Curated annotation (Swiss-Prot):
Gene designation per UniProt: cpsB
InterPro entries in alphabetical order: Caps_polysacc_synth_CpsB, Caps_polysacc_synth_CpsB/CapC, Metal_Hydrolase
Protein name (record): Tyrosine-protein phosphatase CpsB
Reaction(s) catalysed (UniProt annotation): O-phospho-L-tyrosyl-[protein] + H2O = L-tyrosyl-[protein] + phosphate
Record EC number: 3.1.3.48
UniProt organism field: Streptococcus pneumoniae serotype 4 (strain ATCC BAA-334 / TIGR4)
Phylogenetic classification of the source organism: Bacteria, Bacillati, Bacillota, Bacilli, Lactobacillales
Protein's job: Dephosphorylates CpsD. Involved in the regulation of capsular polysaccharide biosynthesis.
Protein's UniProt keywords contain Amino-acid biosynthesis: no
GO molecular function: manganese ion binding; protein tyrosine phosphatase activity
Record has Transport as a keyword: no
Cofactor entry: Mn(2+)
Gene Ontology annotations of biological process type: capsule polysaccharide biosynthetic process
Biological or metabolic pathway of the protein: Capsule biogenesis; capsule polysaccharide biosynthesis
Length: 243
């Protein structure tokens, strides 16, 4: 019901190319039962360096477009911030957005980022009074099968996010993400996940799987847990409330 990680702004990153694509992506998200989407387009040194004024501009146009989808679809502003050290000054001085202007910022790393680097970056952001929500923790080799490390990040004041796509069963044929599904399944079993979110980009390779994932978590982990990960926690994040 509340999706805190999405790529829905046209012509700013690897998401929609056009207004028409953004609308179609919103529509599919709405169809699946999502009622609030936080826009978190990429901020990444050397990869996604679209200027902030453009991202904000196209964002506001997507927010308008969302009215054509449904009147109760709320679009919030945010950023998926790949960590490089310049990001610290940007956050301190609010030149890079948090999630709906809350304390929470969405932070990502590389698949092969060493734990010590992860731990260090997140420690420094915490020192800014900003709470990291760690994007797609199933991506990071450093956390694979590592309850102790994830726990250590959570215990110092981080929250964790897993992509809906990796919540799904590994497919009998054509499975290209088996290792990330196994990782997400590990974290869920260990009860190490605060949030499941879309990371949606398009309707081909990367659609939302929020309805499918919600049902799967309901079946395997109970409805209350599904509510927690897909509604209650995301809602606290959007409303700048402590979890
Ligand atoms: Fe990412
Ligand atoms: Fe993303």
């Amino acid at each position: 019901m509340i999706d805190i990680h999405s790529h829905i702004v046209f012509d700013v990153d690897d998401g929609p190319k056009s207004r028409e694509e953004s609308k179609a992506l919103l529509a599919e998200s709405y169809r699946q039962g999502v009622r609030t989407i936080v826009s978190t387009s990429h901020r990444r040194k050397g990869m996604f360096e679209t200027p902030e004024e453009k991202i904000a501009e196209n964002f506001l146009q997507v927010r308008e477009i969302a009215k054509e989808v449904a009147s109760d679809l709320v679009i919030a502003y945010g950023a998926e911030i790949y960590y490089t050290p310049d990001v610290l000054d940007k956050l301190e001085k609010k030149r890079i957005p948090t999630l709906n202007d809350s304390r929470y910022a969405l932070i990502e790393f590389s698949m092969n980022t060493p734990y010590r680097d992860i731990h260090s970056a997140l420690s420094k952001i915490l020192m800014l009074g900003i709470t990291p929500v760690i994007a797609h923790i199933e991506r990071y080799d450093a956390l694979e099968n590592n309850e102790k490390r994830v726990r250590e990040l959570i215990d110092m004041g981080c929250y964790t996010q897993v992509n809906s796509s990796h919540v799904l069963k590994p497919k009998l044929f054509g499975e290209r993400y088996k290792f990330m599904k196994k990782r997400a399944q590990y974290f869920l079993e260990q009860d190490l996940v605060h949030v499941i979110a879309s990371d949606m980009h398009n309707l081909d390779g990367r659609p939302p799987h929020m309805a499918e994932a919600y049902d799967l978590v309901t079946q395997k982990y109970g409805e209350a847990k599904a509510q927690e990960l897909f509604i209650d926690n995301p809602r606290k994040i959007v409303m700048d409330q402590l979890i």
